[PDB]
Amino acid sequence: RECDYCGTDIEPGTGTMFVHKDGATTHFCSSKCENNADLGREARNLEWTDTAR
Amino acid sequence: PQPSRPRKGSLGFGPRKRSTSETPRFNSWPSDDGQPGVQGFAGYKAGMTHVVLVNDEPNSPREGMEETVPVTVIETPPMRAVALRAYEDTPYGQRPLTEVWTDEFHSELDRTLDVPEDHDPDAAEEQIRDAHEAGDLGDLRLITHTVPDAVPSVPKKKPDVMETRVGGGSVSDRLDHALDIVEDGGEHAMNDIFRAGEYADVAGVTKGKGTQGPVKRWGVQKRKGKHARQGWRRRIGNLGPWNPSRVRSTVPQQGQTGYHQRTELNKRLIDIGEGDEPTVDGGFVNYGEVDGPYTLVKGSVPGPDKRLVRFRPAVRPNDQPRLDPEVRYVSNESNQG
Amino acid sequence: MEALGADVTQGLEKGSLITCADNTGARELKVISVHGYSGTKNRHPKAGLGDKITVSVTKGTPEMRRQVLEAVVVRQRKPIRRPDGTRVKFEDNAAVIVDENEDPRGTELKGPIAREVAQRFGSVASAATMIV
RNA sequence: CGAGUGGCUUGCUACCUCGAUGUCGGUUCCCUCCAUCCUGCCCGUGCAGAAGCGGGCAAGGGUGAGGUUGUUCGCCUAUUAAAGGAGGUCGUGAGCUGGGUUUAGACCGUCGUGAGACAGGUCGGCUGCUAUCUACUGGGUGUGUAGGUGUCUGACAAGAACGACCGUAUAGUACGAGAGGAACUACGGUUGGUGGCCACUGGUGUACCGGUUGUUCGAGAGAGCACGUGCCGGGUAGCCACGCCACACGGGGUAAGAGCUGAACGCAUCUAAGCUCGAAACCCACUUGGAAAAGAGACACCGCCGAGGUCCCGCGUACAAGACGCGGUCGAUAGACUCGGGGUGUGCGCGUCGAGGUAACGAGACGUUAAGCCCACGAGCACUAACAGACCAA
RNA sequence: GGUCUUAAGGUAGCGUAGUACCUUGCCGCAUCAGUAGCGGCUUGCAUGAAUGGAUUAACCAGAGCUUCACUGUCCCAACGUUGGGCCCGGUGAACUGUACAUUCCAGUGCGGAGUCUGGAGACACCCAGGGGGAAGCGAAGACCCUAUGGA
RNA sequence: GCGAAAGCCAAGGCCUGUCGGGAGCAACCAACGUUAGGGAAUUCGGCAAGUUAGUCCCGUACCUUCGGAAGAAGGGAUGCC
RNA sequence: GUGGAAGUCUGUUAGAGUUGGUGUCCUACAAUACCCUCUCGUGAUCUAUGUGUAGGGGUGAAAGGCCCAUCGAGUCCGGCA
Ligand SMILES: *C(=O)[C@H](Cc1ccccc1)NC(=O)CCCCCN
Numbered sequence A: 001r002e003c004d005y006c007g008t009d010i011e012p013g014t015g016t017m018f019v020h021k022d023g024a025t026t027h028f029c030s031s032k033c034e035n036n037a038d039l040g041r042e043a044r045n046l047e048w049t050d051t052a053r
Numbered sequence B: 001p002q003p004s005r006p007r008k009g010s011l012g013f014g015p016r017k018r019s020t021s022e023t024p025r026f027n028s029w030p031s032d033d034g035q036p037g038v039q040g041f042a043g044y045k046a047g048m049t050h051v052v053l054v055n056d057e058p059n060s061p062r063e064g065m066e067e068t069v070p071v072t073v074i075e076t077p078p079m080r081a082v083a084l085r086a087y088e089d090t091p092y093g094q095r096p097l098t099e100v101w102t103d104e105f106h107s108e109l110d111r112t113l114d115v116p117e118d119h120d121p122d123a124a125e126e127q128i129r130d131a132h133e134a135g136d137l138g139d140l141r142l143i144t145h146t147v148p149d150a151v152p153s154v155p156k157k158k159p160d161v162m163e164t165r166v167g168g169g170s171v172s173d174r175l176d177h178a179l180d181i182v183e184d185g186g187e188h189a190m191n192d193i194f195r196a197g198e199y200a201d202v203a204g205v206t207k208g209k210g211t212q213g214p215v216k217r218w219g220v221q222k223r224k225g226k227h228a229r230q231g232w233r234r235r236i237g238n239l240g241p242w243n244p245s246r247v248r249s250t251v252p253q254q255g256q257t258g259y260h261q262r263t264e265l266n267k268r269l270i271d272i273g274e275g276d277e278p279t280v281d282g283g284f285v286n287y288g289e290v291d292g293p294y295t296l297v298k299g300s301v302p303g304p305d306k307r308l309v310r311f312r313p314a315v316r317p318n319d320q321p322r323l324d325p326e327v328r329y330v331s332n333e334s335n336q337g
Numbered sequence C: 001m002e003a004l005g006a007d008v009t010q011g012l013e014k015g016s017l018i019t020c021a022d023n024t025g026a027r028e029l030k031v032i033s034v035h036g037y038s039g040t041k042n043r044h045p046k047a048g049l050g051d052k053i054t055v056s057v058t059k060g061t062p063e064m065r066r067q068v069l070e071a072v073v074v075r076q077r078k079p080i081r082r083p084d085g086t087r088v089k090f091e092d093n094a095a096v097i098v099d100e101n102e103d104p105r106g107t108e109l110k111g112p113i114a115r116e117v118a119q120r121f122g123s124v125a126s127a128a129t130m131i132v
Numbered sequence D: 001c002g003a004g005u006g007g008c009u010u011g012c013u014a015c016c017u018c019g020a021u022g023u024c025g026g027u028u029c030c031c032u033c034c035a036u037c038c039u040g041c042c043c044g045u046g047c048a049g050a051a052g053c054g055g056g057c058a059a060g061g062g063u064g065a066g067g068u069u070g071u072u073c074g075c076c077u078a079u080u081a082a083a084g085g086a087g088g089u090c091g092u093g094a095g096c097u098g099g100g101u102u103u104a105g106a107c108c109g110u111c112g113u114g115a116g117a118c119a120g121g122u123c124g125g126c127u128g129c130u131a132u133c134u135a136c137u138g139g140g141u142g143u144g145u146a147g148g149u150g151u152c153u154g155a156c157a158a159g160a161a162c163g164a165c166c167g168u169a170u171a172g173u174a175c176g177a178g179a180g181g182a183a184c185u186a187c188g189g190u191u192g193g194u195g196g197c198c199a200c201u202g203g204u205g206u207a208c209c210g211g212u213u214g215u216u217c218g219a220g221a222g223a224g225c226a227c228g229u230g231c232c233g234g235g236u237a238g239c240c241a242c243g244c245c246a247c248a249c250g251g252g253g254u255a256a257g258a259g260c261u262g263a264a265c266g267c268a269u270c271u272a273a274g275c276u277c278g279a280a281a282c283c284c285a286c287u288u289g290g291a292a293a294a295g296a297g298a299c300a301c302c303g304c305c306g307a308g309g310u311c312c313c314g315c316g317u318a319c320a321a322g323a324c325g326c327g328g329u330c331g332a333u334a335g336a337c338u339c340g341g342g343g344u345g346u347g348c349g350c351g352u353c354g355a356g357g358u359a360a361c362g363a364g365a366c367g368u369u370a371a372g373c374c375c376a377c378g379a380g381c382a383c384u385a386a387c388a389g390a391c392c393a394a
Numbered sequence E: 001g002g003u004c005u006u007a008a009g010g011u012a013g014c015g016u017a018g019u020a021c022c023u024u025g026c027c028g029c030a031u032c033a034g035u036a037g038c039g040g041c042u043u044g045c046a047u048g049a050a051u052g053g054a055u056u057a058a059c060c061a062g063a064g065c066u067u068c069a070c071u072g073u074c075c076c077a078a079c080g081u082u083g084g085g086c087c088c089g090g091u092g093a094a095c096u097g098u099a100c101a102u103u104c105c106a107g108u109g110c111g112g113a114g115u116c117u118g119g120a121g122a123c124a125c126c127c128a129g130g131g132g133g134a135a136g137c138g139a140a141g142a143c144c145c146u147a148u149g150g151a
Numbered sequence F: 001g002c003g004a005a006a007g008c009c010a011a012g013g014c015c016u017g018u019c020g021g022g023a024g025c026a027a028c029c030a031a032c033g034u035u036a037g038g039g040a041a042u043u044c045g046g047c048a049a050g051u052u053a054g055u056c057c058c059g060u061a062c063c064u065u066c067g068g069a070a071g072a073a074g075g076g077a078u079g080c081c
Numbered sequence G: 001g002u003g004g005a006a007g008u009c010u011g012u013u014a015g016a017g018u019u020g021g022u023g024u025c026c027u028a029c030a031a032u033a034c035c036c037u038c039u040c041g042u043g044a045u046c047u048a049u050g051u052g053u054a055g056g057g058g059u060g061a062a063a064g065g066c067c068c069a070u071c072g073a074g075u076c077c078g079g080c081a
């Protein structure tokens, strides 16, 4: 699997899946990502993110 | 009315004092069923990671499916049965009779023992067989020690010595089996005793926490509400009733917590290998790198990283052995981050 | 009951206010008890995903209000662990009113549902729009 | 109607304390009783089944959360296997609380000429002390057994280390007109309790990194203060629970009870002698402590001019002193350095762009730059420091 | 009852009251559940007109209740910060002390014993702890009664 | 900055609110920070803590002794260049 | 619009007061202290100094409050052994 946020590979037996109100799903590899997300930031704008890279 | 409630903490692991030996001492051994064989082995704790396994359970609606399982990596290099001790049955229980030692010793066993320079193996052996002829021979065990020098991550070189029982077919047959092992050099390995998939009982001295209060040591509540602001936060209500006018040893009080021996039952051996396959990136925190004989124990094991832990075939298993479980993935991800 | 096939950290207590994920006319539900549960001194009875809880209607249609009904917990904010180790959490806490036979009192379920709830309440599941 | 047992209620008595034994309730924490609420094993039934009702053994474990009331009690709600009662100075204020009772202030009603009174109501109304002894939880130093190292034994001691529930198969089966509806056994899970552990999730993380407000160091750069982080955002290690792992069965002897063989009493009889079974209870099993067990233990090796130990030095798998454990050049024990593995989130400077502005100036954007800064972890590495050396000892 | 004591015999209002014994009165609101609170009823143990009655905008560190919001008050506790605490140098009190004292379980005794009686346990000394007991220390009981006491 | 307010800083004063040294510095205590999900279930009682917050614009109920209630409530804005 | 009233409002301006924490202290720093919280803050306001009222007497927006840590009758000595 791949983190729906930063893009790096999610180490198996790890991570969280957040189910949205509408039903959408979002796998996170870590708290760091989840948290950057809750701040309303988009991975594309964070230079450390594989996505942005 | 005062609602009922179980007492705080168990009264079966006391007194809660510091352990006499950092090296565990089993007080029970498996039953003499199968072929003769040493009933235990030892190693040093290193750390934890998880592994993906194929549901092995025949009764699980998930049998055959992936499954993440927590594992504690334990370096289990070879050990050496340096002697065979014999016990005799007497009106006062079992007592050591004699011992059969060898000559081939590990370079640094003298860091702990006054290694034998002159011993009579045969006389000992004779005395034992005569005892057996007379039928006073009590169980047979081997004096064993570890080779810490074989484990880089562990600072000590001084070997840890412990006695392990030998359970086998007949007494004669296992008596012989013992001597054979010893005579060689006593060199044996985890393979020779355990097979991945079997259940073992792991013993060890827990992580020490020095002195601790009742709340942490016994699980008593914290003062609640207003009471927590009056001057008392972590002290129990009272040491007892007016009468009996003495404090009963059963009331939760402060003291040594941790560094106690514990024999944790039915631990499943997920795998027994050798190499660096189980090591984590960056190295096991406060331990080091693994690259040699190892064992993967399901779940947790008492004691801190580097501490000696002991294995013994489960003495009271609940499930039947399900040998060599399929391991599809062993995480090597850094434990830092 | 049947194994949920996932570990749960009850994220609710007696007295908690959760969402009613259905069209029964009940909007808000107040947890009153957890079926088959017995706690321990001072402990607040707890409930999570897959539990059948007794509830009272706090908000909704006048006729539904104040009624004491049964329901099933379909979603909770507090994480749950699935067999492969992954954690799963939702955007809100929700339950669906059920009857004696455990058939939804309503006709439609609003929002997603945890797959685990299926292995327990079939008719509730077979009425789901989305099953994560 | 008669005979009793208990000492929880209420009353009686005035033995004990008025040079004071701190009140009610609650709370917290410990032990116990059985007249048993649930659970185990049983008997009867107006026992078809299911669900009950009544009784016997039985105190191992459990007996929970809430709404009114200071309440104890009690009423009420939803859960539950069940949500039993009672003793411990109506256990528990050198533990807490202080709502009530029961000081001084005040009001109402009633009573009184009045002061003032009223288990009538009402608002407000304080909680002292540095532990000598003893008691227990844990930690040491000595002596005794009578040189040392290592490994054991087990008299005894503690445990609830496990209690309970739901679901599936059995089975829509036995039973029953039907409605309805079991069990043995085998499985999965939950709950409470218990011990441990941190890969995973989560908390902290005044290590660290970034953003930014006010002010001061002229600006810039880089910094101090704003309570012991200014505030905001992220967070490693460790510690943790909200996270994760583990916690039988089975033997032996019994109770109630079901029976066998069997006599007194040729018959009958579970009992008198004998015997087969049979409880969550008892014993063992399992975990923990345990040579100070005065019968003060056993074994192996080393040593009595030398075995071993203490001090010393570098450190922690240990730690309030003490203790404990490891390493000490025949070395990787700690530090430096360099890698590895991690945390932040892209440094200073310079270049280009930039709403504009004559210009000066210019918030900010892009590049250089996964940059800069930082790390309580690992590895490599004898470079630095584990040197020198003292002592006790049959 | 359809007058009598003793002059009159409770009017407007208010009312289960900060006044209501019975009492958690009855009905309703509100809550899953409300001895509370509010509204209605009200025969008021024992309301009521300057012993002021009713009522009332504004005001209140005044008493009670409800809602939203909030949150470590709680479920259930954890980690952290600072000052202590612990070890070391220096300084250096007090409370309290009939004696003896390593106690425990029972009993007995002026009926609430470390010291009596019977048993059990118990090698000595020391460090830290939280306070079960010494009916712990502190105060010639402030309650109650008694005194041919006091104010 | 509304300010004789906070915070920071001069001039001036001081390191005498006068015992120190050591242990990652344990239990426990005083002050205090942060705590996931729940959100008063705590308790006599929300005690303690928390929430809200400055300024401008919009907007503002019952009741009222017409003064008030009222900053009711609720909604939006807020920097730098 | 002007004006700028008020035993008016907000306010740790100064200053006055003392509600809760039943916190800290309780052989105290203190024979009434410390901290946070809280009330008033143009008036029946607060305050310094001077001055008057004296013990069955004062003084008292009244609590039997206060009259030098002393008040339901101050303190000292005497009556008094
Ligand atoms: C009634 O029970 C009295 C009430 C009282 C007496 C005096 C002052 C105020 C209140 N309470 C007592 O008598 C308690 C006595 C305590 C004795 C303790 N040793």
Ligand SMILES: [Cl-]
Pocket (backbone or CB within 6 Å): B222, B223, B224, B227, B228, D028
């Ligand atoms: Cl408490």
Ligand SMILES: [Cl-]
Pocket (backbone or CB within 6 Å): C014, C032, C033, C034, C045, D065, D078, D079
């Ligand atoms: Cl409940």
Ligand SMILES: [K+]
Pocket (backbone or CB within 6 Å): D017, D018, D020
């Ligand atoms: K008395």
Ligand SMILES: [Mg+2]
Pocket (backbone or CB within 6 Å): A014, A029, A030, B337
């Ligand atoms: Mg991760």
Ligand SMILES: [Mg+2]
Pocket (backbone or CB within 6 Å): B230
């Ligand atoms: Mg207090």
Ligand SMILES: [Mg+2]
Pocket (backbone or CB within 6 Å): B334, B335, B336, B337
């Ligand atoms: Mg980690």
Ligand SMILES: [Mg+2]
Pocket (backbone or CB within 6 Å): C041, C042
């Ligand atoms: Mg409670």
Ligand SMILES: [Mg+2]
Pocket (backbone or CB within 6 Å): D021
């Ligand atoms: Mg006392």
Ligand SMILES: [Mg+2]
Pocket (backbone or CB within 6 Å): none
């Ligand atoms: Mg009985």
Ligand SMILES: [Mg+2]
Pocket (backbone or CB within 6 Å): D059
């Ligand atoms: Mg018992």
Ligand SMILES: [Mg+2]
Pocket (backbone or CB within 6 Å): D090
């Ligand atoms: Mg009592």
Ligand SMILES: [Mg+2]
Pocket (backbone or CB within 6 Å): B002
């Ligand atoms: Mg009690």
Ligand SMILES: [Mg+2]
Pocket (backbone or CB within 6 Å): none
């Ligand atoms: Mg006491």
Ligand SMILES: [Mg+2]
Pocket (backbone or CB within 6 Å): D093
């Ligand atoms: Mg007291």
Ligand SMILES: [Mg+2]
Pocket (backbone or CB within 6 Å): D094, D129
């Ligand atoms: Mg005290």
Ligand SMILES: [Mg+2]
Pocket (backbone or CB within 6 Å): D098
């Ligand atoms: Mg009171």
